[PDB]
Design a protein around this ligand. Sequence first.
Ligand SMILES: COc1cc2c(cc1OC)C(=O)[C@H](CC1CCN(Cc3ccccc3)CC1)C2
Ligand SMILES: COc1cc2c(cc1OC)C(=O)[C@H](CC1CCN(Cc3ccccc3)CC1)C2
Lengths: 540, 540
Amino acid sequence: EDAELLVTVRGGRLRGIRLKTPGGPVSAFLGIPFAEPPMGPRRFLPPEPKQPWSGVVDATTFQSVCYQYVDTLYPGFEGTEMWNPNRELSEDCLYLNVWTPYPRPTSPTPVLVWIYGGGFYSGASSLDVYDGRFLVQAERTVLVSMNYRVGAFGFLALPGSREAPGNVGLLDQRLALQWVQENVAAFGGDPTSVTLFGESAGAASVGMHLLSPPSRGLFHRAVLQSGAPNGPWATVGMGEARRRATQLAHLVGCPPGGTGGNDTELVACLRTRPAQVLVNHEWHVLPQESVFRFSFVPVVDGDFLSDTPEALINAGDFHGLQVLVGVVKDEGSYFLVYGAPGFSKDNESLISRAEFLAGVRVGVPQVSDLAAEAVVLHYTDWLHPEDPARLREALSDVVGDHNVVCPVAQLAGRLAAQGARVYAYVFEHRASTLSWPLWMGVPHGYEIEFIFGIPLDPSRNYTAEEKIFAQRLMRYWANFARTGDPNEPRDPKAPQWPPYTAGAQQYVSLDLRPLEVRRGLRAQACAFWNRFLPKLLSAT
Amino acid sequence: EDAELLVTVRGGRLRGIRLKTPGGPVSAFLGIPFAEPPMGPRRFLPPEPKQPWSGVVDATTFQSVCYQYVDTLYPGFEGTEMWNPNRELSEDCLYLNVWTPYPRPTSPTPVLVWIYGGGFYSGASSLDVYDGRFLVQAERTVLVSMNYRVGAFGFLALPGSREAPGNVGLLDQRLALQWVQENVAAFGGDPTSVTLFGESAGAASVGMHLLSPPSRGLFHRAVLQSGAPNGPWATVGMGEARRRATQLAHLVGCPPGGTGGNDTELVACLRTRPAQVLVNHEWHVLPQESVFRFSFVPVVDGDFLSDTPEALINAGDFHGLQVLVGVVKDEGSYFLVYGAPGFSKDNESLISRAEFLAGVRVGVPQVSDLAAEAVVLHYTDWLHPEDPARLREALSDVVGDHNVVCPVAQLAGRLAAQGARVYAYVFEHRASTLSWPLWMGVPHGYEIEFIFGIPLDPSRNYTAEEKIFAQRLMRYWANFARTGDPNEPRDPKAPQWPPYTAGAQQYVSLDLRPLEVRRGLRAQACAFWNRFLPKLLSAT
Ligand SMILES: COc1cc2c(cc1OC)C(=O)[C@H](CC1CCN(Cc3ccccc3)CC1)C2
Ligand SMILES: COc1cc2c(cc1OC)C(=O)[C@H](CC1CCN(Cc3ccccc3)CC1)C2
């Protein structure tokens, strides 16, 4: 047995496993318990630290996926099922994973901490596209990723109550960050150089950790890929969170008619229900027909988030913080097949004008008829207001700008103007092996496999250019993790990545071509979402 | 003795004058009375036909300019003085002019009828840039132009009353069209081929003759240069027209202190005032601070205009009609020096952001704060929201699109989609002799001198290519007058001018270069003005 596959942490001993990459081995410690199993009376409660254990915990394989909805839109399709759970579901899921180089670093090494996305209702650290063996081998970094409770188990909230306070899934991530502080040195990791990175709901989580003081001390840099805490989907109000939790209780027979009412009797009834029963009614508590809206998300309650993310972003001091943010080329196209009329992954989705006007209401729920008119005005090409291909790309722009691109640009500009050093990108390469239709372009989430170096997997059919491209991206992310600057610390030959500033708004395009600098993250479109539309909603 | 300078019309005999051009002489009959002098009790009343006369009326020189405000913004400046009256002011001003080729045409020849602009408060057929000798010589058509009452004398209105019904200036133009029908044959002109063309308020007048049945029978084609009857400045409501007329009465002491003020006593008191006194208070009755707004304009009374121009445009059947419409490249820049803060013709007018925001309220008066926010949203470059040059061009676009380009675009599309054959242009040549500053671009009204072939004047310093350019334009205008199609009926080699359609929205650019076809008359900007902004004001 190799001695480096045995490690002692504060709770006991672990045995890891050695993973192969074409460039060399990596030591992995998969399935480390960092919290007590949040089961029975602990359902909906904040996590408690894992009590110390005797013997050697086996850390050679991923642990269970947290209970979550399983996507059935295209059964058997690679594009959807690559995100579905690949381990059995269980409420016993609070486990984390540590990848470390071989040989183990003798000097403290910067640490990357991955937070998976999935709309706060799904996701797992065990997904194949989150395999950290290639990023750790190529860049000699320590990589950590945790599981956190999603859906009702992580974010059902009766605000104010002690039995279901909400945001416990965010607290799971924090506890994992506290664990990295106390234990990552045992793997050769530097707890003074901890960079967070996450995609979609993981990116929003990273943002919410920036805005929560108890979390802000546990890390030093942030990477937000295609997501932001200020998004219209990433938070809900106290009243709406209470209404969703009460309706979920009703759908599963809580409280038993008609005995019950207060929050204590409601959560107690919810705690007796099998986990699969709660999952089976999760989507039915959404208030309207929509896409890119999720039932149980972080709640703005005054505790984890003392104010709304937008308020904390505006009032925040971010001096001494380095941030990397970005988006993919087609943020919205993915979501249209989940409810927008006329869309299908198996045809060209050449929608009609009427289907476009209906899709706007699904893509922008809970706006006045007048607000929808402004959206139609801004996203119609009035030289070709009936062209199906342009309408398809326009509805994609509507959903992507409203949910991802403009919340990210709002955040990136506020951070740079308030002390943070910001770098911005737009990912523009469509994977050659992508199974989604060509009209979706570079869809939401399909930069992750390049960040994690998946093209290096010899059992995959990526092109030679994509392997070089993945290595360049891993260098950018690692350089940012080590130094706070994605640019090569001294290489002047490679094109340079300028910081993002509220004035110049410079960002780079990430594709097979060398870096190219551009200005403005859809500046015209995002002025509509960030500046005008709120003023329109005020005066109804 | 040239006998062709002698003509008999229905009212008597006339003696014209021969005008010289570099290409040959032209016979001109300037100052033909077509109405009784609208003086004394006739002030504010519809015109009456000129009673027949004995002897030979001298028609060798232009008659008096109708009483009007004289522009004093830049005293002594060519750019402003070229529009001021160049003959004595008088209420005895209802005279028209006829140019005809030499030798007189023996066959009935198509007739161009010019209607001058000037915001319905100014203008005169005697202005040097309306000299018809070059258009008539080069293209062998008959040209007619009339004087019509402007300001209070043409458009003061107490709706309902008989003493000041309004729109009498439009009736003056109609009477001149009736005169052309009854008399233009005596000059070699074909009353079955009459093309109206006008600029600015003249273009708005031409449009209102399309929408008035009694006038619609007196002509066969329309040309609307930089103006439309549906503009926000071209008409006024009954209630507002009554308020303006009543305030004018108050400012000139009408009615006297302690006197009833029904419409009869008010107009009677107004008729006793010297004409210059009414002029001296004309601008004081505008309801708020503005540019491109005029005190006395056509009123939507139910008589001359049975409904609003917009309503009549939408419900109208225009089969059998050919229209030529167009705009200059920089419609708005001219007006900014008449009230927009920070603007001056003698500097670069590099306005600040605050001046831009103030200018929007002056350029778009009578809109809510939310409407102004939408205007700022649509016209700000949010990548350079403080750049003075871009803000200067943006406010020019605001004023020009709101007042000219979008009313013209809406009209052109409704005409083409409802039976009319339509041709559209954008005039993009800045005269080499233009005295206005370079930042104004191609300002409002500076295509007229090219349409009338003024570059051919030997006493002017136009370039050789501007002389050739002027000849192309006169050919386009005359071909449209003859056939209804500006394209050369012979030459297939010359670039073709496609009709404007509500779908393809094709137009051509007019400059020193050959014709270039483009699509959309600022389609994105005009969707804001024509589609969204009305919905925004309805919801207040
Ligand atoms: C079952 O009902 C619904 C299911 C979904 C929606 C709405 C629904 O009801 C209307 C959505 O809007 C979802 C669309 C996302 C699902 C996950 N993928 C993949 C992905 C996962 C993690 C990171 C990045 C991409 C992207 C689109 C799912
Ligand atoms: C004295 O008060 C005012 C005077 C004017 C305005 C506002 C005023 O008060 C705010 C305007 O908006 C006017 C601007 C026009 C004046 C004449 N020219 C020239 C022209 C004449 C005829 C056809 C084409 C061009 C174009 C702009 C004048």
